[PDB]
Amino acid sequence: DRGVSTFSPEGRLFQVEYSLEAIKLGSTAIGIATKEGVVLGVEKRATSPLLESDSIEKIVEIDRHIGCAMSGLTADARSMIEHARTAAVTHNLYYDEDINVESLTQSVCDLALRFGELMSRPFGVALLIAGHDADDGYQLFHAEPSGTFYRYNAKAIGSGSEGAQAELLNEWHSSLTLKEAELLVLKILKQVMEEKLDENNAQLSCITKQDGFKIYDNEKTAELIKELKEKEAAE
Amino acid sequence: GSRRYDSRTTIFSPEGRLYQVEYALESISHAGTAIGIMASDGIVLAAERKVTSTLLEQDTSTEKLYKLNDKIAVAVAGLTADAEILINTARIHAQNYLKTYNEDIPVEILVRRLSDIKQGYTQHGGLRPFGVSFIYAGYDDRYGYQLYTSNPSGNYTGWKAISVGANTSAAQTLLQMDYKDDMKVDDAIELALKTLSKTTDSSALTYDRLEFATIRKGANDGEVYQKIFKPQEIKDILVKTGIT
Amino acid sequence: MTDRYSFSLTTFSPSGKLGQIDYALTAVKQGVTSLGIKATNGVVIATEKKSSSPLAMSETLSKVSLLTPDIGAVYSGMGPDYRVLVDKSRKVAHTSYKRIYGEYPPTKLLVSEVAKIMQEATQSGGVRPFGVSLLIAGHDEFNGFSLYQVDPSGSYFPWKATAIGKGSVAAKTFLEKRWNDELELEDAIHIALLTLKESVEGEFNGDTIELAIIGDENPDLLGYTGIPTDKGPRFRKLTSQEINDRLEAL
Amino acid sequence: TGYDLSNSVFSPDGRNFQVEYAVKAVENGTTSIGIKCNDGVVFAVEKLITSKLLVPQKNVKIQVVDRHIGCVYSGLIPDGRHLVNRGREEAASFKKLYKTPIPIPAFADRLGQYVQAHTLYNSVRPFGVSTIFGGVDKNGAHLYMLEPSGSYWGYKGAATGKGRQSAKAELEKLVDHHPEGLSAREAVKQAAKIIYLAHEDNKEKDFELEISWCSLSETNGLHKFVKGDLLQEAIDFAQKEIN
Amino acid sequence: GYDRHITIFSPEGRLYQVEYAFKATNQTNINSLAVRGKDCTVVISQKKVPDKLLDPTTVSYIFCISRTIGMVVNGPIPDARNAALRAKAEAAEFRYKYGYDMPCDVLAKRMANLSQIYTQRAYMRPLGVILTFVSVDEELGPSIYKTDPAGYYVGYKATATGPKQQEITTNLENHFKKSKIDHINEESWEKVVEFAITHMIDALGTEFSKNDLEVGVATKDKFFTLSAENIEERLVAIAEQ
Amino acid sequence: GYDRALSIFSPDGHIFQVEYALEAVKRGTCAVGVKGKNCVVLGCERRSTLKLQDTRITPSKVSKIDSHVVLSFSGLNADSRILIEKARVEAQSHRLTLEDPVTVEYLTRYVAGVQQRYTQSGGVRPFGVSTLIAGFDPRDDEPKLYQTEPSGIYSSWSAQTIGRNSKTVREFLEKNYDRKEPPATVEECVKLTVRSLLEVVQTGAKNIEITVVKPDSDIVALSSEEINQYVTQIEQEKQE
Amino acid sequence: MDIILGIRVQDSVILASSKAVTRGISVLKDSDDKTRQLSPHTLMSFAGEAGDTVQFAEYIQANIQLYSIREDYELSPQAVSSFVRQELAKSIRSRRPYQVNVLIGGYDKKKNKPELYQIDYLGTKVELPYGAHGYSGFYTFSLLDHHYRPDMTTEEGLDLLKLCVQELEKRMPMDFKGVIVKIVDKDGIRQVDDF
Amino acid sequence: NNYDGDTVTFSPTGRLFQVEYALEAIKQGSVTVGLRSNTHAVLVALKRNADELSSYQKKIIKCDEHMGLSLAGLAPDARVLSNYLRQQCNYSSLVFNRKLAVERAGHLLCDKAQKNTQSYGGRPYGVGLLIIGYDKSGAHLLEFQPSGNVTELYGTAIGARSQGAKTYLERTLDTFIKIDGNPDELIKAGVEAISQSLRDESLTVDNLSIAIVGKDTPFTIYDGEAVAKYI
Amino acid sequence: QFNPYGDNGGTILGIAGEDFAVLAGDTRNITDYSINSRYEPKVFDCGDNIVMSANGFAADGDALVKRFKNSVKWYHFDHNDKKLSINSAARNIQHLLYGKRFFPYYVHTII
Ligand SMILES: [Cl-]
Ligand SMILES: [Mg+2]
User: Fold this and answer.
1) What's the structural domain count of chain H?
2) In-domain check, residue F30
3) Cβ contacts (< 8 Å) between A141 and chain I: which residues?
4) Which residues in chain F are contacts of C125 at CB distance < 8 A?
5) Would you identify the CATH topology of the domain D10-242?
6) Best mutation site among H93, H96, H223 for testing chain I: the one with the most I CBs within 10 Å?
7) Residues H131 and H144 sit within 8 Å (Cβ to Cβ)
8) Which stretches of chain G are assigned E, i.e. beta strand?
9) Residue F148 belongs to a domain with what CATH number?
């Protein structure tokens, strides 16, 4: 056939480029970083109404100060999360401190290109890693299967990403409140989702310095959806 | 490098079938028919040797029926050499169990172990599967008399009567027609031979083209006897049942 | 480096054929004729010494090989493959039997071990099957005299008499007419020489024929005296002169 | 066909096409030479000046093995370096066990067997270099040249790379006109000339000359680079001959 | 058609890579010959130095494997030296383990078994060489044993290898048909070398100078190669009768 | 060792080996899971192409992983045994180290993790098996029903079906299962499970297996006659 | 650990095991249950080196429970004891052996017979009517030799066991803080809560 | 074509296509410039962003107090190679109490890259590196290609549109080599060099990345408002 | 028998002030009754405003300080030149020391 670690004539790794296509098929995930916190939100996308949607876990805690949202082949993310959690805890064991969000992201991204003929293929999942540390404050990173990570003020991944990213381009400013960011994620998710957005097919979360990483209750998110509907009807 | 020459023996087709397993089963369909029939008072194993010669030493020959221990025997359909590899593994597993628990291995536990080995060759290692189907005839004190089959996929199932190898479709129809639950060994002997006699690709069914075995509680009192039939004894049972 | 051929080179084709085994059998078909006949008081194995050049000393090339003192082997097909199998067969007779039980293996079990080696070349990674069919003759106390054929697949069958290689189909027909259960060893040797003459084109004598027997114990070939229970090897290779003597009464 | 897609495959001719393709990489490289003199050997190489930004005298190509062997090569420079690293390991283990520094014929076979080993399997690629090497041992001077196949022979003079035909013709004249032999200092001068003459095949870009030598009288049997006044003298001698 | 790239059976029961390794054998365009005397074994081979820049002393296809065993190779020099180094290692190991010098026929068998492995295992290629081993064995006397890429080997009364092997073979065959003996009935090795050179000249139809030949001689307890001047003396004797 | 990457991405971002493993699941006999208010029922299809079978000894379709959790499947039977064995070992390993039996979610997560691993390990093909894992957590009376598939994704279901013609029985369940009021009793839950299989099965004879799991390690398999009574009652109501 | 006794009567097996856990100077606990249920009708009491005892007992328990789930079948007491013996016989030639002695009391539901097996840390197995480990046998066996009958009831077995425990409490130097007694019969395993 | 499936295969003209394709990944990467005088050595790197919300990908990595590089191509491969350089620099300090020579650092990178070009299963590195350093023989600049070829230079550039900066340096050679004891003027020459490779975009405060090492200057990286002085 | 440990003597003293800290140590190095050196520095600046001394067996002491200094260097590389706080250094040293739990560094460390 052909090598798994083969370069194309353009200078790209075939397998990495193909895994990026799998991520485009995945459900939408959005992150927005503010000075009051980082917000993470996902589309759940249940395949059937009999599927109990609260068992869909696409937003995950890595440590108290670091959360993570995923998009693509979500089964692939389990070993990445496990590594991230282990790295976060291990660093605390060795250094009696929280690990920097960038250092955690870098550790996860070191796994990405360990494939060949090690694992047999790249990961088919992209991650939004959000967190806080004392040195660089509130941060949002986008971790790919290429091993590259970019920091973002705001970022969307998955099937509605380019439409969402264009929307985040206009809406993000450096003075956004946490409440404003929550509504903004809900607004953009509602825009790109096939089904109508509610508390059972979408999920919110945030990371603040005071309270750490929290996945929002369906009751809490439901109120923020109702608040969104009213403020859009207000003009 | 080496990838160029790799057949990739452990992959799914677009339809979700295992190529090599399917093709191994195709191989097995050209092997001599083996039949197992389970009765209330015993089990019969009958099997057809493939187009023999007059110069083949039959009394010292074994290609179909093998002893795994004193309570369990197998009938083979497929590559004989492949079967002997698995048979020796099974014989060891039975003795490992006996050494550990000081009790003879239950029939299903032996069958599952061999079947799991076959399964491994379909999922990992990049090697061709074993081109063998087994009929297991055995007795233990939990389930009594048992018949099983396993094939190159590593899937196994239990049976009252079953065939493997050539003309299984025709053979299974004939067994399904004449089998009854209250049947006895002497009746089952007759059914097995009658079924082979009709399904055989040979002109006539003779003693020199058969291997035959019974597992009976026809052993003096509360015990089980395996009888691998001799050439003369197969000749006698062919006259008794009225085939020659 | 490293052997990166960890996958099977013999696989099932859509029709259920193992191509490499069939092709190995084809290589056996091209090989020189060898045969075996079992008598009441012995076994004979024979083949043609097809000399590649007249400058070659064909006595140095042994087609018939002693495996144990009571077991011998001959082949048809690829000679080098045969030579390494004989080395492995001799060794396995010791490692898996004599070093355990203090005696040489019975014919059927040594055959079983050789068969296993040939089967593994049919399934293991990065190897082709052996391109030979063996005929193994031997004696042991509880089974008596026996003759076995072993094919590239690893399958083996016992025979009263048989032939393999070039003119096997004609030779097996010839043997069917002549073989009975009352043959003495000398009668089997006579039949072996008659059968082998049909498949040989050129010279037919003790120097172009290799023939060995499994027969009576040869105390003269033991190499020592003093132990009554050790009576010597039953395997004996016939000399060039001994063959020619039986070609006058032919 | 398909016999050229994999290393260690005999074609129907009895040829290993992958080795023959490695030779094409060698032929594409810069010209390098070797001259066996009376009590030693001289190595020289053409270094193409791709740009003014290359620091003069810095990108050294000739490599020492142990203290008495010089190696120069044409083709894929990294492959040459890999071969020399192995050569250094072989020369070290030889000296460790046997005390004496590795003889040149002994060293030649160590490289030879290693290069040949890379024509035995499809899991490795043949070496994309021809290597000219040698030095002084207990039995005197020795010059060798080693091809991608693992083939090597002893030489009076050797040349490889893009300007090898030109160089070979010049070397053949020296052999004919000096049956009694050539001195080490003569061989340095002649080496400079031959590289300058062989530079006609690479005439587009200008080049930098690099010479080294082992001689029993001139360097005490140790490998040294030709530097300063002796290098300039050889450059002047070379420049005079082309005009 | 990947049955032609690796050592697996073709539908005809053939190994094409083995057959093609036999063709690589004649790539050097060199012919060798070996014969047995009463007390010696002589091997001769053509020497061709096409380049004037070559050091002719280093151009050789004859190898001193052990003190007693010599080996001439027909095939490319890298594979020749691969086989040489291995044979040397095997011969040395044999002596260490078993306490006596490795016999010529046993070494031939060992190298043949190694060659066989390359015809069965896919990752290893055959070596494109034919190895002719010579000695005066302490048990069997003068010995010639030859190995090829198929893993075949056999003893010889005399033998020839190369592009023009058949011409040399038939020439030798005819001589032994006359004499009706398995060797050259001659006391001195010097005259057995003279026989070998004479019959190569007759078979090939070419004359030889001292630099056109390469000679190896096996006697009891040593194998040695002749210098150009030792060969010259041999050529002078041939011309003078 | 054999290291070959069998599960790899294609230009359109698909891993075909994983997708072809799902096609093996599609071929497998139908399996269904329905959770009531205080129970979970696992129903399984038995193809009647095989008669002369010995049903005493033939491998049953529903397997106990521990005393409180069961596993059924659709796809390759031989593959399922490897997952069941690993799951059973992990269940005992969990009891040994945590001093508490596995939750149904934990056991599911483990099995799903094994399945995922076989989609990005060298030299191995994915499992041609989807599972339904059902039971009750220790000292908990809330029913649990999960599903896994070859890719290694898993999720919780009020009711679910897998295998051949699972599209049809899922259609049935989606209209007949109410979340606000699940099958309040064992009877209602078994009835709805038998009804769902009768959309696909053929004869209601020896072709339907039913296993009821209740809280506190109360697991029982229904017999032929007990199931036959459900089959009889369903069609007599249908004749109207 | 210290005293472990076993007695097989007509229709049951009774295992008595001390409650004391002593770490050198002090008695850390006086209610310790030195037993594990291997299957519904098989109980194993144990005594030996600290840590190894519980580690071994739980390891065996896990393995038998695994077998029970895999086969949907309870192994016979004979089969369980043979498994346990092999584990100890394997252990004795290890880098660091399990220093554990066990009694296995089980009711065989097939034969309808109680069975008591005594296995020491070397892997020395014997089936007995009554058994002990350590110094317990030295005091108790003379009483059991006298009073034991194969047709004894469970109540008679408990009374004979009380006499054994009384003799131990009189003549043993160590205070073992009484015993926990458990009965294994056709109905399974139960603890006698007043002894 | 038929000879680009893996790195173990020469083409009929003696080319290694997988290596050449790895070389192509460098040409897609963002421009970076290297230059030196006799006292100091400078790296200038144009950082690339994904979009306006994203950060600008870091291009310069420190390897020791006296050595570091800039990258162009696959950033994870640069991390692997720079980590290897950090280890080798560190081994030299710990074992020999010796700062690793820049020339020797080049040789080690060459040999590491080479092994990936001659063995089956692996792949070449997909990144080009510009290594600067100050050691016992003064200032140095190296250019690493994943073919294995390492070259010592006065100045150079790699990445997209690098040819413009490379020509400028080739003209300015005689001027910038003489900028001794003036770090700011040497950086100015590097910033002016990298400007010859810009199109449409210009050097902003979060776009530009500069690094310097010299006689009494540890390897230090300047980003953000620290480079506004040179815009 | 070979004894891998030795005693190089010496004494060290650390005192924490309100907004400062001192770590002092004598400069004498000894074996048995002999003086090896009258000035062999024992207290080291390890970077990040941390001072360290590992007193006892000087070979193990020098090894530990060397490894901790190295740990500081790699902390900078791996965590964006972040300053290693004294508490984090202390935990890191615990792991260095405990890594050799069954062949200990024969030193009493103060930072
Ligand atoms: Cl050998
Ligand atoms: Mg091969």
Assistant:
1) 1
2) yes
3) none
4) 2
5) Glutamine Phosphoribosylpyrophosphate, subunit 1, domain 1 (3.60.20)
6) H93
7) yes
8) 4-8, 12-18, 21-23, 26-29, 35-39, 42-48, 100-108, 113-119, 125-128, 130-133, 179-185, 188-192
9) 3.60.20.10
